[PDB]
Amino acid sequence: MVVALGLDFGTSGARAIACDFDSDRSVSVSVTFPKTSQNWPQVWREALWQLLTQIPADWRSRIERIAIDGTSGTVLLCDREGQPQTEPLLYNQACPIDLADLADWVPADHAALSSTSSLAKLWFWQQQFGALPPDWQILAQADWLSLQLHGCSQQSDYHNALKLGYSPDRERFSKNLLDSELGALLPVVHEPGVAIGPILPAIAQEFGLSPDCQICAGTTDSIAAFLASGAHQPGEAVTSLGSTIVLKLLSQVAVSDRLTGVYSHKLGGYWLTGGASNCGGATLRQFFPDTELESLSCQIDPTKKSGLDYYPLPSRGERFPIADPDRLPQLEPRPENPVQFLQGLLEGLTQVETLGYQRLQDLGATPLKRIWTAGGGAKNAVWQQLRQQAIGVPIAIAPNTEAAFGTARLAAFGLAAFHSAGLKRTLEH
Numbered sequence: 001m002v003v004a005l006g007l008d009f010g011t012s013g014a015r016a017i018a019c020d021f022d023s024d025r026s027v028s029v030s031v032t033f034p035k036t037s038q039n040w041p042q043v044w045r046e047a048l049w050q051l052l053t054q055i056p057a058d059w060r061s062r063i064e065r066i067a068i069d070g071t072s073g074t075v076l077l078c079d080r081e082g083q084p085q086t087e088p089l090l091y092n093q094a095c096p097i098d099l100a101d102l103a104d105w106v107p108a109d110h111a112a113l114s115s116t117s118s119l120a121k122l123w124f125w126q127q128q129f130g131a132l133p134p135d136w137q138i139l140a141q142a143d144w145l146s147l148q149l150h151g152c153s154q155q156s157d158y159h160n161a162l163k164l165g166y167s168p169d170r171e172r173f174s175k176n177l178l179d180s181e182l183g184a185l186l187p188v189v190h191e192p193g194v195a196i197g198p199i200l201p202a203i204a205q206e207f208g209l210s211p212d213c214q215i216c217a218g219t220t221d222s223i224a225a226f227l228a229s230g231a232h233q234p235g236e237a238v239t240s241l242g243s244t245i246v247l248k249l250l251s252q253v254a255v256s257d258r259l260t261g262v263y264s265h266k267l268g269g270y271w272l273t274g275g276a277s278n279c280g281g282a283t284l285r286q287f288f289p290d291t292e293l294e295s296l297s298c299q300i301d302p303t304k305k306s307g308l309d310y311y312p313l314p315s316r317g318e319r320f321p322i323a324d325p326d327r328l329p330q331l332e333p334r335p336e337n338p339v340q341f342l343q344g345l346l347e348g349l350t351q352v353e354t355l356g357y358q359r360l361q362d363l364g365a366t367p368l369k370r371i372w373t374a375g376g377g378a379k380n381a382v383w384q385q386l387r388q389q390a391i392g393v394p395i396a397i398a399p400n401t402e403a404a405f406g407t408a409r410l411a412a413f414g415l416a417a418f419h420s421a422g423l424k425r426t427l428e429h
């Protein structure tokens with residue numbers, strides 16, 4: 001097999017992981033971003049070079065494929081040569097545009113129809129600049145960074161391109177969009193993991209990389225995190241028990257529900273759907289520090305219900321599994337015993353995950369087969385028991401959770417595992 005390099009540019013820093021997949025060995029390096037910047041592109045690019053520099057020379061001489069994940073909806077408006085013409089619009093920033101202005105360019109309830117989408121941001125830039133030059137380009141963070149390595153302009157992947165208006169189901173931008181004032185700025189879209197081009201000669205020599213090293217189409221940090229688990233059978237899921245509960249479910253068919261923010265990414269011959277609740281670990285942290293979560297959790301017997309019926313929102317408003325912007329946290333009655341209170345909370349969170357996966361199924365997704373767990377709550381075995389009892393499928397801690405590692409797997413193996421040849425055997429004599 002191959003020594004491959006994955007680069008993860010996330011919300012607060014970047015990480016690089018190089019893996020020798022025959023020896024199953026690896027090296028990891030990282031850089032931390034400032035909270036603010038006058039020149040984010042400079043920060044990101046310098047981070048890229050820092051990461052490469054930190055990798056030992058002998059590893060660098062062996063890297064054959066490279067891939068990059070970036071944050072979703074972080075975009076840059078660049079000239080022909082890839083120089084940013086204005087500040088980037090970050091993944092979390094929303095644009096004050098009329099979504100009706102986009103209606104002719106994507107299907108109804110397409111995921112791009114959101115004030116934070118790459119498409120919303122390109123349109124905002126169009127209105128702000130008046131008329132965008134056709135030789136210019138819009139690039140996602142991942143796009144721009146890989147451009148620093150392979151020199152090929154206007155290149156993206158069908159994960160990052162989704163919220164720019166790509167329709168992975170028909171593998172195209174709508175003709176209406178391509179023919180519009182914005183068409184000339186759109187990227188050519190490839191499958192994540194496919195080789196875009198060889199590394200730039202000068203970059204290869206500067207950093208001691210093979211000049212035959214290939215740079216692959218990238219992905220988003222969220223998807224990269226899913227790729228880290230190794231899951232590739234429809235029905236397999238990764239639950240992230242973090243500040244919020246985030247569900248990702250591998251499915252044979254695409255599902256969507258704009259009301260609850262549910263949409264699907266293409267993933268080889270399959271689809272990755274999911275959803276994000278406002279409930280999660282942040283609610284727990286409002287009441288208990290991690291050490292207390294531990295010390296109290298081991299006093300809980302999950303085989304006996306608490307009698308408490310909580311909905312553990314950290315504040316007003318729920319998004320998923322069921323949308324209600326007015327929904328109140330339901331945290332009463334609060335019993336005297338903190339152990340029982342914590343059990344009530346864990347039971348509530350468990351209901352959020354249970355209803356979440358069952359909901360995805362009810363929208364048409366492949367029925368849940370098993371769950372891999374990531375995030376701060378993953379090692380809570382009492383919570384794991386409650387979840388297993390409520391959901392009725394095997395649950396375990398994900399083998400790997402690092403987005404950089406998922407992206408390294410993407411560089412090494414692409415999306416080959418995500419096709420029906422790998423399904424469970426049904427052969428019987």
Ligand SMILES: Nc1ncnc2c1ncn2[C@@H]1O[C@H](COP(=O)(O)OP(=O)(O)O)[C@@H](O)[C@H]1O
Pocket residue numbers: 241242243244280281282283284285290293294297375376377379380383
């Ligand atoms: N033993 C535990 N059981 C349940 N939740 C925990 C435990 N330890 C930490 N957490 C929760 O994990 C959350 C942070 O998860 P993490 O994924 O590390 O951060 P983030 O979600 O912000 O990326 C915190 O809100 C904390 O309450």
